[PDB]
UniProtKB/Swiss-Prot annotation, chain F:
Belongs to the Hfq family. Residues 4-62 form the Sm domain. The gene is hfq. Homohexamer. The chain holds residues 6 to 67 of 82 of the full protein. One of its GO terms (biological process) is regulation of translation, ncRNA-mediated. One of its GO terms (molecular function) is RNA binding. It comes from the Bacteria. The lineage of its organism: Bacteria, Pseudomonadati, Pseudomonadota, Gammaproteobacteria, Pseudomonadales. This is RNA-binding protein Hfq.
Length: 260, 66, 61, 67, 67, 62, 68, 262, 67, 67, 66, 67, 67, 62
């Protein structure tokens, strides 16, 4: 087995009050990649967030409310690294990576880009910087699993009424083109769309009860994995959890097992 | 003989340098431009000078009509 | 092999081709050869013979 | 040469309902109308031309005896 | 050329050894080879489905047979 | 072709080789015999495979 | 083989012994350098030799720009 | 109405069954499916047309050694396909598994080792049970309903065996076996047809060779048609005729609402 | 009325396998379990209600004689 | 009403004239007419096939007929 | 009922205007209408078939009639 | 009579709005609505062609019009 | 009796002006919001006033599940 | 009628996913919400009401 959980909690505190800690504790998994901690590493040090039988790793942004990402693993990773050299990355700890034998996973959290124009500019900046870094991450032997919420949909199949969202951030032409270039040209794939080419599957919908009723979801979570692991995809699922997190948990299993 | 229709189409795409998107049998989309071709090979110029074997090319979709 | 596809092309029958990867292609037959089939649908979406699995015309011929 | 052609000719003459499965595993159905060295015509509601290089196996719905 | 697969398959057929042909798609095909020729082998399944070589990948006999 | 030197060298030295198929499943075992169409692995079951669905043959030891 | 554009490419990849990244159809990647080639096989020298088949190679992406 | 009588009998050797005229009772009991576990003979022995029932297709996989085990399975209608083996040595080397596909349903024949002969047999049984729960977690993952006609050689609850206080140490009620079966049933959601249709005690299948145990009805319910809950609702009834015991296990008779088809 | 009821009753009692054609030209198969004055329930593996408004022609595979 | 259907069908069935009934889907159905009633017509051909009136488009006698 | 259909058909019959009836299926019919009723209709062509009104879509005469 | 159907047709007639009648099959019919009656509609154009009500699928006026 | 279900449902869909994507029996996809209807004709409002007959409609697909 | 009502009611009382085929050959599978002499609602992504006269065959999943 080889499970991976992705829950952009948008605040580990709200996650705790919503019962995310108990759900993850009950949810038997190998690695858990929650995003947007909205708290300092010292806050994550609170044993309440420490899941029984899992390690604690977290990198906080310069400003807690800005972001922050954490990573829980069942076995001691070979090494944990944070940052990518970019200001938009280092100054906010939006990237944290653990190292295991043969495969090393990472936790990515892109800026929403929907708050303001400056957020969209930062999004474009981080996108170009990240595709550059990944170009530098081509011939690298170690296979990767960039588990992160990219705040962008690849195809219309990933979001309904695209006609209305075409101009709204998250589905704009340049972001979709960047994602397509990152996926196809560079040989990267996705476990879900590979194992299950089924529409209507989303992760992030408005907290508004109306959108939840009519299910206005935007697929923002993606299990970006190097082509080496593409062959070892078991199955993907997007549970419709009752408002536990804006980004619904993204659980995927893999045929390839892990090792220290 | 074998490429009476493939050869002229590929040669026109090359001369016109139309940005094409090659879809592999594996389903991986490959955007870029056709640099050169032959019997069973096509050179795609992009960020990385790529060589895609014809036997593994499913479809090619030029972005503009030719 | 040749006569069937030639009739499909000349008669302008709406053809839908399922590739070996399963992709359901749609379009009309523009021109074909030993190892190539030009599919006319907005753009000249060329399709190779080795990757074609089934050719589904909309009506018999 | 010695086995494929007689088997397919018998399937055609007897018009046995055969079930063909593609290399990918997709299950097809229909009768063998005409054979070819590179292709086959499977008439099932709408005649579909299937390529031989994409045929995994040919499952006849009824047992057949070679000549 | 083609001097090795012929005797191997002929011996597998003569002794009627249960072979498990694993297709390229990862599907099992337990049965006995009834015959074989170019671009074709004939299984001894309840229906005796005719398989194509291009699709076949491996031919493992359940019991190790001698050459 | 360089395929036959490689294969017969592995056969003479009987090096445990790991063969990857087109699907990707990892096979293991020595090579007993081979021709242009098939390979006869020396595995516990000696699973025979045709040459039209091979990916890469690599020896576990240099 | 009539035009043989693959032959000059493989020859320049081998003569300079450039690090190649031969992708396969299954999805795995094979790092190394082309030692030699023929019609259906290519030799990758990564500690040990790899008998990667031609018909299984999806794309060949050299990590080193090769002028030609 | 839509009915389907699946029959299962652990003959513990098709020869002893033929001696008792089992073939006649089976040909007269024209039902949908008939399974004969523990053939104790090679397929060439089963090739004797006497064992073949009229209107049925013979399929059987024999162990490495004929007297070791082997299982057969008759089918009123030609199944879609028949397969043998499970990938495990403890299964392939002994032909303890044989499946016959049909349509949206695959009636499988399982043969767990008795584990009562020696300690090594019980260790092999534990290993086979572990590998079998693994194969259940890996196979059911594929879209399909399974009917596991298997002699598990294990009693689940005290209701499946009298004077259990004397059978605590006896194979079939051991703590690990009970725990494994309870996990397979509840944790995985699998159920049994007989208990579902009738939660009645004193109903058993296996009886000791000792005539006194048969007289006082000291029997064990070792056979279970563990099936996916999808088909669980379609069980009609179950029966365990106390006829002259045809083999170490008794005739397990069950009728379903489903009707199999090619 | 005078012809539909006897025909349907005979087809039902005799269990003749009929080949119900659809208005679109598709040829279906299966046995009839019970008919109604506006719809018929034809069972093929599982019951499948077929609307008379979508039936073009009902051809019994076996000759039948009216009562 | 229905004053012309009755005599037409009676003359068609009494003389036993083959009619190439062009189905609504485009298929032509040859053979004579056995009987007829309210929204139902029986065919005289290989088998007593039932034809629904609501699915019939044109009934061509081909041969000259009068009434 | 048929306040407009009956006069139109009776006038077409009296003036024997050759009318072309196009069925919903697309097939083409030709021939003047000899007689008609509330359902079927008699034709003038060599075969003189009985067309069904439920299958008729349009009736275009060769000459406009009052 | 009808609640809106007959008033709608009368309004379409009063101003002779050019209306394009679409057939269930898919073909279009140009020309203004000359007159109308239950089960029939007369069209004004090059010829006094009459269309059948049961065959019409959609009636779209060339200009937005209200009852 | 005959309009106990479709009438209030369609009235609610109309009042809620939910964007509808109506599908014709021919398979064409129309869009808009129904503004009025009675018993044999449905009036759809959009860029161009459209009148659709009920006997030709296959499904009425709103953009939101109405209660 | 006498046959359609009870069977169509049981097809929902038992939660049987019903698949209906349109005359054009289009297939839709969903749970029936309510039915009438001319309308039958099929639970899908949205409440897609279907006209009785347009349904060709009703093949339930079980």
């Amino acid at each position: 087995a080889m499970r991976i959980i992705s829950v952009n909690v948008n605040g580990i505190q709200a996650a705790a009050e919503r019962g995310l800690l108990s759900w993850l504790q009950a949810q038997n998994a190998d690695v858990i990649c929650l995003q947007d901690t909205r708290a300092s590493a010292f806050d994550l040090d609170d044993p309440s967030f420490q899941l029984d039988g899992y390690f604690l790793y977290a990198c906080d942004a310069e400003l807690p409310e800005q972001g922050g990402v954490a990573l829980y693993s069942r076995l001691q990773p070979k090494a944990v690294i944070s940052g990518l050299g970019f200001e938009t990355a280092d100054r906010y700890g939006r990237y944290l990576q653990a190292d295991f034998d043969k495969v090393s996973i990472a936790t990515l959290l892109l800026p929403s880009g929907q708050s303001g124009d400056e957020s969209l500019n930062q999004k474009f900046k981080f996108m170009d910087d990240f595709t550059h870094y990944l170009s530098k991450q081509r011939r690298k032997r170690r296979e990767y699993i960039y588990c992160g919420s990219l705040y962008v949909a690849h195809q219309k199949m990933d979001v309904k009424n695209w006609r209305e969202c075409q101009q709204m951030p998250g589905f704009l032409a340049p972001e979709r083109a960047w994602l397509d270039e990152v996926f196809g040209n560079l040989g990267y794939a996705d476990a879900l769309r590979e194992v299950s080419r089924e529409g209507d599957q989303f992760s992030w919908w408005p907290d508004s009860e109306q959108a939840e009723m009519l299910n206005l979801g935007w697929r923002f979570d993606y299990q970006v994995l190097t082509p080496g692991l593409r062959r070892f995809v078991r199955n993907a699922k997007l549970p419709r959890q009752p408002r536990f997190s804006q980004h619904a948990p993204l659980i995927v299993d893999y045929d390839w097992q892990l090792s220290i | 003989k074998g490429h009476s229709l493939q050869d002229p189409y590929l040669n026109t795409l090359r001369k016109e340098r139309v940005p094409v998107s090659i879809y592999l049998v594996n389903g991986i989309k490959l955007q870029g431009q056709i640099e050169s071709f032959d019997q069973f090979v096509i050179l795609l110029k992009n960020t990385v000078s790529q060589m895609v074997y014809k036997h593994a090319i499913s479809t090619v979709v030029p972005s503009r009509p030719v």
